[PDB]
Design an enzyme around this catalytic site. Structure first.
Site, mmCIF file in Angstrom:
data_model
loop_
_atom_site.group_PDB
_atom_site.id
_atom_site.type_symbol
_atom_site.label_atom_id
_atom_site.label_comp_id
_atom_site.label_asym_id
_atom_site.label_seq_id
_atom_site.Cartn_x
_atom_site.Cartn_y
_atom_site.Cartn_z
ATOM 1 N N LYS B 50 0.788 -1.219 0.000
ATOM 2 C CA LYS B 50 0.000 0.000 0.000
ATOM 3 C C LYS B 50 0.835 1.292 0.000
ATOM 4 C CE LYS B 50 -1.567 -0.900 4.115
ATOM 5 N NZ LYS B 50 -1.061 -1.983 5.049
ATOM 6 N N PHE B 91 13.351 -4.652 3.320
ATOM 7 C CA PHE B 91 14.472 -5.312 3.922
ATOM 8 C C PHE B 91 14.041 -6.155 5.144
ATOM 9 C CE2 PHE B 91 17.493 -4.084 7.465
ATOM 10 C CZ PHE B 91 18.350 -5.152 7.302
ATOM 11 N N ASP B 96 12.012 -11.076 7.986
ATOM 12 C CA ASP B 96 10.919 -11.461 8.913
ATOM 13 C C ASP B 96 10.161 -12.660 8.388
ATOM 14 O OD1 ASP B 96 9.022 -10.445 11.339
ATOM 15 O OD2 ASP B 96 7.733 -10.873 9.596
ATOM 16 N N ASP B 100 9.859 -15.837 10.597
ATOM 17 C CA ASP B 100 8.486 -16.203 10.950
ATOM 18 C C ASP B 100 7.939 -17.429 10.212
ATOM 19 O OD1 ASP B 100 8.675 -14.121 12.580
ATOM 20 O OD2 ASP B 100 7.492 -12.644 11.592
ATOM 21 N N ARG B 105 3.146 -13.025 1.258
ATOM 22 C CA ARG B 105 3.316 -11.619 1.593
ATOM 23 C C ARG B 105 2.748 -10.832 0.429
ATOM 24 N NH1 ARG B 105 4.302 -8.471 5.882
ATOM 25 N NH2 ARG B 105 5.820 -10.033 6.604
ATOM 26 N N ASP B 167 10.898 -9.713 19.996
ATOM 27 C CA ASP B 167 9.895 -10.550 19.296
ATOM 28 C C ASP B 167 10.315 -12.044 19.313
ATOM 29 O OD1 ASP B 167 8.864 -11.783 16.428
ATOM 30 O OD2 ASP B 167 7.321 -10.378 16.981
ATOM 31 N N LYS B 193 9.791 -2.941 17.464
ATOM 32 C CA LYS B 193 9.707 -3.708 16.222
ATOM 33 C C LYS B 193 8.928 -3.064 15.129
ATOM 34 C CE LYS B 193 5.888 -6.978 16.437
ATOM 35 N NZ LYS B 193 5.513 -8.427 16.325
ATOM 36 N N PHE B 232 -1.221 0.201 15.544
ATOM 37 C CA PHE B 232 -1.088 -0.384 14.220
ATOM 38 C C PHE B 232 -0.657 -1.804 14.408
ATOM 39 C CE2 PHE B 232 1.134 -1.398 10.262
ATOM 40 C CZ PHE B 232 0.277 -0.887 9.276
ATOM 41 N N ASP B 236 -2.307 -5.403 13.368
ATOM 42 C CA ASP B 236 -1.567 -6.428 12.617
ATOM 43 C C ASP B 236 -1.744 -7.815 13.227
ATOM 44 O OD1 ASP B 236 0.574 -7.059 10.426
ATOM 45 O OD2 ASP B 236 1.458 -7.909 12.295
ATOM 46 N N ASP B 237 -1.644 -7.883 14.558
ATOM 47 C CA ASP B 237 -1.873 -9.125 15.328
ATOM 48 C C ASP B 237 -3.302 -9.608 15.213
ATOM 49 O OD1 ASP B 237 0.758 -8.733 16.138
ATOM 50 O OD2 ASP B 237 0.258 -8.107 18.174
HETATM 51 C C1 LIG Z 1 2.814 -4.624 7.901
HETATM 52 C C2 LIG Z 1 3.103 -3.394 7.201
HETATM 53 C C3 LIG Z 1 3.267 -2.099 7.846
HETATM 54 C C4 LIG Z 1 4.281 -1.055 7.205
HETATM 55 C C5 LIG Z 1 3.956 -0.871 5.706
HETATM 56 C C6 LIG Z 1 3.835 -2.230 4.875
HETATM 57 C C7 LIG Z 1 3.189 -2.182 3.306
HETATM 58 C C8 LIG Z 1 1.851 -1.443 3.198
HETATM 59 C C9 LIG Z 1 4.138 -1.623 2.021
HETATM 60 C C10 LIG Z 1 4.775 -0.330 1.941
HETATM 61 C C11 LIG Z 1 5.697 -0.036 0.873
HETATM 62 C C12 LIG Z 1 6.386 1.208 0.835
HETATM 63 O O1 LIG Z 1 7.144 1.572 -0.045
HETATM 64 C C13 LIG Z 1 6.246 2.214 1.741
HETATM 65 C C14 LIG Z 1 5.389 1.945 2.786
HETATM 66 C C15 LIG Z 1 4.689 0.734 2.905
HETATM 67 O O2 LIG Z 1 3.957 0.677 3.862
HETATM 68 C C16 LIG Z 1 2.894 -3.444 3.123
HETATM 69 C C17 LIG Z 1 2.167 -3.774 1.983
HETATM 70 C C18 LIG Z 1 1.924 -3.958 4.059
HETATM 71 C C19 LIG Z 1 1.877 -3.390 5.424
HETATM 72 C C20 LIG Z 1 3.183 -3.461 5.813
HETATM 73 C C21 LIG Z 1 3.938 -4.818 5.553
HETATM 74 O O1 LIG Z 2 3.773 -9.870 12.610
HETATM 75 P P1 LIG Z 2 5.112 -9.277 12.351
HETATM 76 O O2 LIG Z 2 5.794 -8.420 13.338
HETATM 77 O O3 LIG Z 2 6.254 -10.480 12.045
HETATM 78 C C1 LIG Z 2 4.837 -8.259 10.888
HETATM 79 O O4 LIG Z 2 3.947 -7.229 11.272
HETATM 80 C C2 LIG Z 2 6.118 -7.781 10.260
HETATM 81 N N1 LIG Z 2 6.766 -6.771 11.118
HETATM 82 C C3 LIG Z 2 8.055 -6.945 11.441
HETATM 83 C C4 LIG Z 2 8.415 -5.928 12.234
HETATM 84 N N2 LIG Z 2 7.374 -5.113 12.366
HETATM 85 C C5 LIG Z 2 6.347 -5.649 11.675
HETATM 86 P P2 LIG Z 2 4.055 -9.257 9.601
HETATM 87 O O5 LIG Z 2 2.711 -9.532 10.141
HETATM 88 O O6 LIG Z 2 4.171 -8.380 8.459
HETATM 89 O O7 LIG Z 2 4.893 -10.506 9.425
HETATM 90 MG MG LIG Z 3 6.123 -11.755 10.324
HETATM 91 MG MG LIG Z 4 7.859 -11.113 12.761
HETATM 92 MG MG LIG Z 5 1.968 -10.052 11.994
#
Ligand SMILES: C=C1CCC[C@@H]2[C@@](C)(CC3=CC(=O)C=CC3=O)[C@H](C)CC[C@]12C
Ligand SMILES: O=P(O)(O)C(O)(Cn1ccnc1)P(=O)(O)O
Ligand SMILES: [Mg+2]
Ligand SMILES: [Mg+2]
Ligand SMILES: [Mg+2]
Ligand SMILES: C=C1CCC[C@@H]2[C@@](C)(CC3=CC(=O)C=CC3=O)[C@H](C)CC[C@]12C
Ligand SMILES: O=P(O)(O)C(O)(Cn1ccnc1)P(=O)(O)O
Ligand SMILES: [Mg+2]
Ligand SMILES: [Mg+2]
Ligand SMILES: [Mg+2]
Lengths: 346, 346
Positions: B50, B91, B96, B100, B105, B167, B193, B232, B236-237
């Site tokens: 996004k 990166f 991750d 994980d 993804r 984590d 994290k 946020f 995610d969780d």
């Molecule tokens: C879990 C997240 C939180 C951080 C943001 C991140 C994005 C939205 C990709 C992204 C690409 C970029 O270039 C700049 C910012 C971005 O957010 C991906 C798709 C899913 C959500 C995710 C992985």
């Molecule tokens: O759940 P995570 O922290 O491993 C995750 O949110 C990735 N992430 C890693 C660090 N901060 C966020 P994702 O659900 O994208 O696998």
């Molecule tokens: Mg993960």
């Molecule tokens: Mg993780």
């Molecule tokens: Mg997660």
């Protein structure tokens, strides 16, 4: 010898590296267990080697700074930047051991092979890398070389990552082509993967610390140090098969992992067509009796004698290159470092 | 909406990012195949999300710089630094996904799950990280914020690595303690994290670009943005179990991987002792019918309603915090970003 005297003082500086990396963020108690894990990561993966790259920073800095500028503080920073080189090393090695499927490093099990570590080692590595930039800010934030040093460590990491990509692209698992394993490809791989970070980085670090920042004095240093880095890696490839793991501290995997080793390039240059096929059938596979067959073939073309012959000629050439390009730097800088890798077997 | 307009212009800047990362070193032809691999690494792992974090850089920069300072060049740099945030993301995510043991993804297979990539992904990740510093030097080397930006990206990586260590330490495989899964531990994990790199980094990046470097204006921004980052991550969780993988683009693993998810913390706070035991027996194991049992238990304590209730209260609190600490910055900066994550389900 210049190295061997300075070793002990350099290794003792490690307790404080660890202190300062553990202390300065323990005023956030919530991360305490992270920090404890860092300490462990550092003690397992920064200690146990020969320290030559980190020592090169201290030695060269002694040789390039006027002793009336080598105050207690100025030396702290030298030893710290020395340890920054060491942590870069540690970072790549921990990750290399995973991508190479290695067993041992420096006489113990690889960090990722330890019960309860595994692929968590990936983040361990990344931390090692961050610690470099933490120390630079701690010990050098106010020096006029601070930004030169940061760009240098970053640039050297990109270069060594581009080198690893080449290393890995040329060695896809379960997939022979003997044919990609050329001299040209070899020299390219080894230039990027080893030669910048193992040779140029530490000397350049010490140049920037002494205020020698000029493009021309760096390029000339570079000319010597890349070529020494090529030699060093060919030595690494020879030791991977013919080294003694009680000296080297590590078990070879180049043949298994299908690598563009110097050995295989030389091999291919010498091979009868049916020797070629024996290589084809046996290279890059995990099976112990197929590795043994390759080794025999290498031995059957006196490649250990071809290595001893390369070592002498390279040495003479690096020395020519020093006569050519050392100026206006003290030649002891290059000579001490060439002494350190000539004849080496760990 | 401010986001949604600017998306398209930002995504089109990606062709040039890739051009400049591929071009500027292709005057070394020997690494050509490395560079080609980089291109692939970038197209697979930077595209498809996004872009909100990278967009936050562009949006905030528009709101903080006077439009007579937003020349064509100054905007190039904004979009580029936006993409630097994106590559940081890429990166950590690539690494991750390996740590994980994830499957998908952004609606496709994880990079390390692709045939012929595997654990080479480790070096792919490190390259993504180096690209950040390459672009900063390319597009911003002569700006007075250049060093602020470098320290910011480095500091945010260390913080997010310290967070990952936490984590992973709190989620050792095949090893329950329910008992480490507290609120205090949770908030600490998620602060490091996710919250620094996903919220503070991009806004701060854009602050330094606009010449707002003062310690107090950063700490106040930080106060808002860490708390939004906590929210946020709780989101995610929640989505890891109750999200729709055609929206989220990814399959959950938190229960399997024995994670300190917000769900499990809440669970533990509510559990009868014999519910506790059901959790004990079933959590952190790979077996599909044991995961299902945990989910049922979560559902049996209306934790999805407890999530919807948390979302409202957090929102009201972040808004209070904005009323408190936005000054002297435009509140639209925080509001546009809070709009972007309120109600979200990818
Ligand atoms: C879990 C997240 C939180 C951080 C943001 C991140 C994005 C939205 C990709 C992204 C690409 C970029 O270039 C700049 C910012 C971005 O957010 C991906 C798709 C899913 C959500 C995710 C992985
Ligand atoms: O759940 P995570 O922290 O491993 C995750 O949110 C990735 N992430 C890693 C660090 N901060 C966020 P994702 O659900 O994208 O696998
Ligand atoms: Mg993960
Ligand atoms: Mg993780
Ligand atoms: Mg997660
Ligand atoms: C293959 C290598 C070439 C580069 C150097 C590296 C060392 C010697 C460790 C070391 C630690 C340090 O702090 C500073 C410099 C260092 O060289 C390890 C033991 C074995 C050889 C190895 C892995
Ligand atoms: O043989 P490699 O390149 O993988 C090695 O030399 C490590 N290395 C990695 C990059 N440069 C050197 P090591 O033999 O230490 O495993
Ligand atoms: Mg190796
Ligand atoms: Mg290797
Ligand atoms: Mg080797």
């Amino acid at each position: 010898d210049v190295y061997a005297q300075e070793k002990q003082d350099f290794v003792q500086h490690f307790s404080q590296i660890v202190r300062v990396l553990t202390e300065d963020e323990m005023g956030h108690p919530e991360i305490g267990d992270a920090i404890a894990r860092l300490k462990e990561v550092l003690e397992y993966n920064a200690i146990g080697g020969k320290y030559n790259r980190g020592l090169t920073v201290v030695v060269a800095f002694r040789e390039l700074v006027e002793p009336r500028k080598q105050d207690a503080d100025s030396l702290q920073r030298a030893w710290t930047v020395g340890w920054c080189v060491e942590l870069l090393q540690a970072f790549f090695l921990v990750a290399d051991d995973i991508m190479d499927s290695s067993l041992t490093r420096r006489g113990q099990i690889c960090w990722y092979q330890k019960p309860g570590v595994g692929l968590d080692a990936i983040n361990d590595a990344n931390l090692l890398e961050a610690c470099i930039y933490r120390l630079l800010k701690l010990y050098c934030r106010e020096q006029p070389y601070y930004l030169n040093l940061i760009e240098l460590f970053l640039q050297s990491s990109y270069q060594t990552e581009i080198g690893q990509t080449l290393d890995l692209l040329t060695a896809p698992q379960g997939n022979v082509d003997l044919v990609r394993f050329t001299e040209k490809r070899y020299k390219s791989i080894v230039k990027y993967k080893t030669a910048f970070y193992s040779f140029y980085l530490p000397i350049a670090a010490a140049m920037y610390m002494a205020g020698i920042d000029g493009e021309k004095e760096h390029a000339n240093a570079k000319k010597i140090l890349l070529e020494m880095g090529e030699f060093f890696q060919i030595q690494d490839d020879y030791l991977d098969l013919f080294g003694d793991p009680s000296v080297t501290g590590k078990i070879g995997t180049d043949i298994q992992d299908n690598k563009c080793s110097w050995l295989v390039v030389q091999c291919l240059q010498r091979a009868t067509p049916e020797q070629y096929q024996i290589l084809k059938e046996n290279y890059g596979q995990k099976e112990a009796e197929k590795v043994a067959r390759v080794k025999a073939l290498y031995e059957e073309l006196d490649l250990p004698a071809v290595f001893l012959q390369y070592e002498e000629d390279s040495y003479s050439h690096i020395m020519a290159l020093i006569e050519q390009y050392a100026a206006p730097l003290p030649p002891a800088v290059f000579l001490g470092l060439a002494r350190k890798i000539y004849k080496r077997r760990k």
